[PDB]
Short mmCIF file of C-alpha atoms and ligand atoms in Angstrom, two decimals:
data_model
loop_
_atom_site.label_atom_id
_atom_site.label_comp_id
_atom_site.label_asym_id
_atom_site.label_seq_id
_atom_site.Cartn_x
_atom_site.Cartn_y
_atom_site.Cartn_z
CA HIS A 3 215.11 151.81 140.93
CA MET A 4 216.11 154.26 139.74
CA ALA A 5 215.38 155.67 143.16
CA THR A 6 214.40 159.29 143.61
CA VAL A 7 215.57 161.21 146.67
CA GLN A 8 211.96 161.30 147.98
CA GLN A 9 212.40 157.57 148.49
CA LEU A 10 215.10 158.22 151.17
CA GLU A 11 213.12 160.74 153.30
CA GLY A 12 211.61 159.89 156.68
CA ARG A 13 212.90 158.27 159.85
CA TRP A 14 215.29 155.33 159.65
CA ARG A 15 216.20 153.14 162.63
CA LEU A 16 219.50 151.27 163.06
CA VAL A 17 219.18 147.44 162.94
CA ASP A 18 222.67 146.21 162.00
CA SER A 19 226.19 147.57 162.20
CA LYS A 20 229.54 146.14 161.03
CA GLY A 21 233.00 147.73 161.44
CA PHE A 22 231.76 150.94 163.02
CA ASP A 23 234.30 150.72 165.86
CA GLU A 24 237.11 150.35 163.34
CA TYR A 25 235.67 153.25 161.32
CA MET A 26 235.63 155.54 164.36
CA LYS A 27 239.22 154.50 165.16
CA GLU A 28 240.42 155.57 161.70
CA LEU A 29 238.80 158.99 162.18
CA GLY A 30 240.75 159.27 165.46
CA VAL A 31 237.84 158.84 167.96
CA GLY A 32 238.97 158.07 171.52
CA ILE A 33 237.94 154.87 173.28
CA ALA A 34 235.30 156.38 175.61
CA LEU A 35 233.42 158.21 172.88
CA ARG A 36 233.80 155.10 170.71
CA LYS A 37 231.97 152.90 173.23
CA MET A 38 229.27 155.56 173.51
CA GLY A 39 228.93 155.52 169.73
CA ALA A 40 228.41 151.75 169.66
CA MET A 41 225.84 151.59 172.47
CA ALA A 42 223.46 154.02 170.81
CA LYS A 43 220.52 153.05 168.64
CA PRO A 44 220.50 156.30 166.64
CA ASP A 45 217.56 157.30 164.47
CA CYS A 46 218.52 158.98 161.26
CA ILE A 47 216.11 161.60 159.82
CA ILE A 48 216.49 162.74 156.21
CA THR A 49 214.45 165.37 154.36
CA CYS A 50 215.00 166.83 150.87
CA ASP A 51 213.24 169.96 149.59
CA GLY A 52 214.35 170.05 145.96
CA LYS A 53 218.11 170.45 146.20
CA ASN A 54 217.97 171.35 149.96
CA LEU A 55 219.03 168.40 152.17
CA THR A 56 218.89 167.96 155.95
CA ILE A 57 220.13 165.00 158.05
CA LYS A 58 219.34 164.72 161.74
CA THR A 59 220.29 162.11 164.29
CA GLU A 60 218.30 161.17 167.40
CA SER A 61 219.86 158.58 169.69
CA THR A 62 218.57 157.56 173.10
CA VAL A 63 221.32 156.13 175.40
CA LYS A 64 219.51 153.92 178.02
CA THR A 65 222.21 152.74 180.45
CA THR A 66 222.69 151.23 183.87
CA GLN A 67 225.28 153.32 185.72
CA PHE A 68 225.69 150.69 188.47
CA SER A 69 223.98 148.18 190.73
CA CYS A 70 225.29 147.81 194.26
CA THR A 71 224.67 146.89 197.84
CA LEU A 72 224.78 149.95 200.08
CA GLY A 73 228.00 150.01 202.11
CA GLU A 74 229.62 147.40 199.85
CA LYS A 75 232.63 148.62 197.86
CA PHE A 76 232.60 147.70 194.14
CA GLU A 77 234.17 148.40 190.70
CA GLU A 78 232.23 151.00 188.72
CA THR A 79 232.38 151.53 184.96
CA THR A 80 231.49 155.18 184.26
CA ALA A 81 230.09 156.98 181.22
CA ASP A 82 233.45 158.68 180.62
CA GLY A 83 235.21 155.32 180.80
CA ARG A 84 236.93 155.26 184.18
CA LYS A 85 237.26 152.06 186.21
CA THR A 86 236.72 153.31 189.75
CA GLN A 87 236.52 151.84 193.25
CA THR A 88 233.06 152.97 194.38
CA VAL A 89 231.14 152.69 197.65
CA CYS A 90 227.63 154.10 198.22
CA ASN A 91 226.11 154.95 201.58
CA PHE A 92 222.78 156.39 202.63
CA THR A 93 224.01 158.79 205.32
CA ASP A 94 221.92 161.39 207.13
CA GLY A 95 219.15 161.50 204.51
CA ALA A 96 221.53 161.77 201.57
CA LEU A 97 222.83 159.23 199.08
CA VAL A 98 226.64 159.53 199.07
CA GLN A 99 228.81 157.89 196.38
CA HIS A 100 232.55 157.88 196.75
CA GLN A 101 234.81 157.14 193.77
CA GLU A 102 238.50 156.24 193.97
CA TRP A 103 240.64 155.59 190.86
CA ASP A 104 244.30 156.18 189.80
CA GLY A 105 244.78 157.74 193.29
CA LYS A 106 242.36 160.54 192.32
CA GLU A 107 238.99 160.91 194.14
CA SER A 108 235.41 162.17 193.71
CA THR A 109 232.23 162.27 195.79
CA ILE A 110 228.70 162.54 194.48
CA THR A 111 225.91 163.49 196.85
CA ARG A 112 222.15 163.15 196.17
CA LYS A 113 219.65 164.88 198.48
CA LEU A 114 215.97 165.78 198.38
CA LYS A 115 215.46 169.54 198.71
CA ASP A 116 211.90 170.87 198.26
CA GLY A 117 210.72 167.93 196.14
CA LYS A 118 213.72 168.37 193.82
CA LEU A 119 216.72 166.07 193.47
CA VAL A 120 219.80 168.15 194.21
CA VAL A 121 222.92 166.40 192.97
CA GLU A 122 226.36 167.61 194.08
CA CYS A 123 229.74 166.60 192.76
CA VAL A 124 233.19 167.37 194.14
CA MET A 125 236.65 166.73 192.77
CA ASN A 126 239.70 168.38 194.28
CA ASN A 127 238.65 172.04 194.11
CA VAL A 128 235.95 171.68 191.43
CA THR A 129 232.30 171.42 192.44
CA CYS A 130 229.06 171.11 190.48
CA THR A 131 225.27 171.17 191.17
CA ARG A 132 222.47 169.60 189.17
CA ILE A 133 218.77 169.95 189.96
CA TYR A 134 216.31 167.30 188.85
CA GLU A 135 212.53 167.24 188.85
CA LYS A 136 210.43 164.11 189.42
CA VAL A 137 208.66 162.59 186.43
CA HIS B 3 211.05 163.05 209.54
CA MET B 4 214.11 163.47 207.26
CA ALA B 5 214.55 161.92 203.79
CA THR B 6 214.28 158.14 203.23
CA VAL B 7 216.08 156.30 200.43
CA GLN B 8 212.68 155.26 199.11
CA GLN B 9 211.94 159.00 199.02
CA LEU B 10 214.65 159.26 196.34
CA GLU B 11 213.11 156.49 194.19
CA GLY B 12 211.81 157.25 190.67
CA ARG B 13 212.37 159.21 187.46
CA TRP B 14 214.24 162.50 187.91
CA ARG B 15 214.76 164.83 184.99
CA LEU B 16 217.47 167.51 184.76
CA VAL B 17 216.24 171.13 184.89
CA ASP B 18 219.33 173.13 185.95
CA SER B 19 223.11 172.80 186.11
CA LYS B 20 226.01 174.85 187.55
CA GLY B 21 229.67 173.91 186.82
CA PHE B 22 229.14 170.57 185.12
CA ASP B 23 231.48 171.28 182.23
CA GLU B 24 234.41 172.16 184.53
CA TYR B 25 233.65 169.03 186.54
CA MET B 26 233.86 166.80 183.49
CA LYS B 27 237.11 168.63 182.66
CA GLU B 28 238.68 167.86 186.10
CA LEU B 29 237.80 164.13 185.71
CA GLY B 30 239.76 164.20 182.40
CA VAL B 31 236.85 164.14 179.94
CA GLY B 32 237.86 165.09 176.41
CA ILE B 33 236.54 168.20 174.71
CA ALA B 34 234.24 166.34 172.27
CA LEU B 35 232.46 164.25 174.91
CA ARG B 36 232.10 167.20 177.27
CA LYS B 37 230.11 169.07 174.57
CA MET B 38 227.70 166.15 174.43
CA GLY B 39 227.53 165.83 178.20
CA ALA B 40 226.23 169.39 178.32
CA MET B 41 223.92 168.99 175.24
CA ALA B 42 222.12 166.02 176.75
CA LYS B 43 219.26 166.38 179.24
CA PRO B 44 219.37 163.06 181.11
CA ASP B 45 216.66 161.39 183.08
CA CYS B 46 218.00 159.85 186.30
CA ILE B 47 216.38 156.64 187.42
CA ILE B 48 216.85 155.53 191.01
CA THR B 49 215.57 152.25 192.52
CA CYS B 50 216.36 150.85 195.98
CA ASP B 51 215.18 147.42 197.23
CA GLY B 52 216.08 148.21 200.87
CA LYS B 53 219.87 147.91 200.57
CA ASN B 54 220.16 147.09 196.85
CA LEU B 55 220.59 150.32 194.86
CA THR B 56 220.65 150.83 191.11
CA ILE B 57 221.01 154.12 189.30
CA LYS B 58 220.00 154.18 185.66
CA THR B 59 220.47 156.99 183.14
CA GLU B 60 218.54 157.81 180.01
CA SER B 61 219.15 160.75 177.69
CA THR B 62 217.97 161.44 174.15
CA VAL B 63 220.24 163.52 171.92
CA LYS B 64 218.63 165.31 168.93
CA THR B 65 221.31 166.89 166.73
CA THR B 66 221.07 168.14 163.13
CA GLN B 67 224.16 166.49 161.60
CA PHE B 68 224.11 168.99 158.71
CA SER B 69 222.00 170.94 156.27
CA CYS B 70 222.92 171.79 152.70
CA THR B 71 222.13 172.07 149.04
CA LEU B 72 223.19 169.17 146.83
CA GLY B 73 226.35 169.74 144.82
CA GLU B 74 227.44 172.69 146.91
CA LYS B 75 230.37 172.66 149.41
CA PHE B 76 229.81 173.63 153.05
CA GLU B 77 231.68 173.42 156.38
CA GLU B 78 230.34 170.44 158.34
CA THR B 79 230.61 170.10 162.12
CA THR B 80 230.69 166.32 162.85
CA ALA B 81 229.65 164.52 166.08
CA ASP B 82 233.20 163.47 166.92
CA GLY B 83 234.40 167.08 166.63
CA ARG B 84 235.83 167.54 163.13
CA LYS B 85 235.26 170.53 160.92
CA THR B 86 235.12 169.20 157.38
CA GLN B 87 234.55 170.50 153.91
CA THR B 88 231.63 168.41 152.82
CA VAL B 89 229.57 168.08 149.67
CA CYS B 90 226.52 165.87 149.07
CA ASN B 91 225.54 164.63 145.65
CA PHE B 92 222.63 162.37 144.76
CA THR B 93 224.06 160.18 142.00
CA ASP B 94 222.51 157.14 140.30
CA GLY B 95 219.93 156.53 143.06
CA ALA B 96 222.54 156.95 145.82
CA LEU B 97 223.24 159.76 148.24
CA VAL B 98 226.96 160.36 148.41
CA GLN B 99 228.52 162.52 151.10
CA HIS B 100 232.23 163.37 150.79
CA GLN B 101 234.30 164.90 153.57
CA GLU B 102 237.68 166.67 153.37
CA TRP B 103 239.78 167.82 156.32
CA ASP B 104 243.54 168.00 157.12
CA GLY B 105 244.48 166.27 153.87
CA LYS B 106 242.37 163.29 154.99
CA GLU B 107 238.95 162.30 153.55
CA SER B 108 235.87 160.11 154.01
CA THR B 109 232.85 159.14 151.99
CA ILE B 110 229.42 158.17 153.33
CA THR B 111 227.17 156.68 150.66
CA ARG B 112 223.45 156.23 151.38
CA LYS B 113 221.58 153.55 149.44
CA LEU B 114 218.20 151.84 149.40
CA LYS B 115 218.26 148.04 149.40
CA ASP B 116 215.03 146.03 149.86
CA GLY B 117 213.27 149.06 151.39
CA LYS B 118 216.13 149.17 153.94
CA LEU B 119 218.63 152.02 154.18
CA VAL B 120 222.20 150.87 153.70
CA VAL B 121 224.84 153.33 154.71
CA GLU B 122 228.46 152.57 153.92
CA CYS B 123 231.19 154.70 155.49
CA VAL B 124 234.74 154.59 154.11
CA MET B 125 238.00 156.04 155.40
CA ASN B 126 241.13 154.96 153.49
CA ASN B 127 241.04 151.17 153.75
CA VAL B 128 238.37 150.94 156.49
CA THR B 129 234.74 150.06 155.63
CA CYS B 130 231.75 150.36 157.88
CA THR B 131 228.19 149.25 156.92
CA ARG B 132 225.09 150.15 158.91
CA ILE B 133 221.54 149.02 157.97
CA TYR B 134 218.33 150.94 158.88
CA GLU B 135 214.58 150.22 158.68
CA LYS B 136 211.83 152.81 158.06
CA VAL B 137 209.70 153.95 161.00
C1 A9M C 1 224.09 157.54 163.13
C2 A9M C 1 225.59 157.74 163.36
C3 A9M C 1 225.87 158.83 164.41
C4 A9M C 1 226.36 158.14 165.70
C5 A9M C 1 225.41 158.38 166.90
C6 A9M C 1 226.11 159.23 167.98
C7 A9M C 1 227.54 158.79 168.36
C8 A9M C 1 228.28 159.63 169.43
C9 A9M C 1 229.74 159.86 168.97
C10 A9M C 1 230.07 159.28 167.59
C11 A9M C 1 231.50 159.53 167.11
C12 A9M C 1 231.65 159.07 165.64
C13 A9M C 1 231.22 160.09 164.59
C14 A9M C 1 231.38 159.63 163.15
C15 A9M C 1 230.08 159.84 162.40
C16 A9M C 1 229.51 158.58 161.74
C17 A9M C 1 228.20 158.78 160.99
C18 A9M C 1 228.11 157.74 159.87
C19 A9M C 1 227.18 156.58 160.26
C20 A9M C 1 225.68 156.93 160.08
O1 A9M C 1 224.84 156.03 160.01
N1 A9M C 1 225.39 158.26 160.03
C21 A9M C 1 224.02 158.80 159.92
C22 A9M C 1 223.74 159.26 158.49
O2 A9M C 1 222.92 158.30 157.81
C1 A9M C 2 224.55 162.46 184.00
C2 A9M C 2 225.32 162.78 182.72
C3 A9M C 2 224.96 161.75 181.65
C4 A9M C 2 224.59 162.48 180.35
C5 A9M C 2 224.51 161.46 179.16
C6 A9M C 2 225.65 161.67 178.12
C7 A9M C 2 227.00 161.96 178.77
C8 A9M C 2 228.20 162.20 177.86
C9 A9M C 2 229.47 161.92 178.67
C10 A9M C 2 229.29 161.90 180.20
C11 A9M C 2 230.57 161.59 180.97
C12 A9M C 2 230.53 162.30 182.31
C13 A9M C 2 230.73 161.38 183.49
C14 A9M C 2 230.69 162.08 184.83
C15 A9M C 2 229.34 161.80 185.47
C16 A9M C 2 229.04 162.68 186.67
C17 A9M C 2 227.69 162.43 187.32
C18 A9M C 2 226.86 163.70 187.19
C19 A9M C 2 225.85 163.75 188.32
C20 A9M C 2 224.51 163.21 187.83
O1 A9M C 2 223.58 163.98 187.60
N1 A9M C 2 224.47 161.87 187.69
C21 A9M C 2 223.29 161.12 187.24
C22 A9M C 2 222.86 160.19 188.37
O2 A9M C 2 222.40 160.98 189.49
CL1 CL C 3 226.97 173.26 183.18
#
């Protein structure tokens, strides 16, 4: 020191955190988003062009949704933070996943349609389709 | 020959989506975490040892936290959903970021210690420290 601002530029990778959960709580961050925040190894990117300063974050969130035996009911912990009663079946060429929690209910279907992974979700009256391509 | 489960095995990467925001909404997902759910482009990883099925997820989220000139107030949109009045000063070798919203405030000070980046976040009485290494 004294450090210039050019000394802070580049990519920085998280290696230690303390009290972050508490910090998010004091901002008013909800539990689900909080757990997401703490499971992410964010990269911080800083650049400074004279007085002009930019800060970017880049976090990958590698996560196991669930492991299960087909046909065996289990307790799922979801990304949004529900504790559901889930059973998966491979039925008629499709991978069905049925979620029960709080008396509510959702089904998620996964089929192969023209080499693409068509994913279909259903709750009450609300549906949703996602297409994936193989890597 | 209709689909096998082993036909669904591998890395699948999102390319299209209808109604996913509404779906998250019906499940009870909060506004802030919805926004992220739509901003992410997950990879879906599916493995199936006969009857043992695991679905993994993996999504990278690049987001420019903010962009400013030092000493000069701007409106910041934070990851957890706040809109803050923010200013960033570089003072005595340290990057200081100060946030004001709803008569509340927070300071995020960015320092260099032993080549490492040491980021302290403070709201009222709550202190969070995160360390980073250069890549
Ligand atoms: C790297 C922290 C961002 C967290 C990664 C994504 C988290 C998803 C939701 C997070 C909700 C909490 C938002 C409060 C912002 C905290 C940024 C200060 C810590 C930091 O190292 N900020 C980077 C500046 O050096
Ligand atoms: C898939 C979304 C993850 C995106 C990563 C960040 C998400 C932020 C919050 C997400 C909470 C939403 C939870 C509801 C999950 C619904 C499964 C969607 C179908 C799918 O493609 N599921 C993948 C397996 O086939
Ligand atoms: Cl959508």
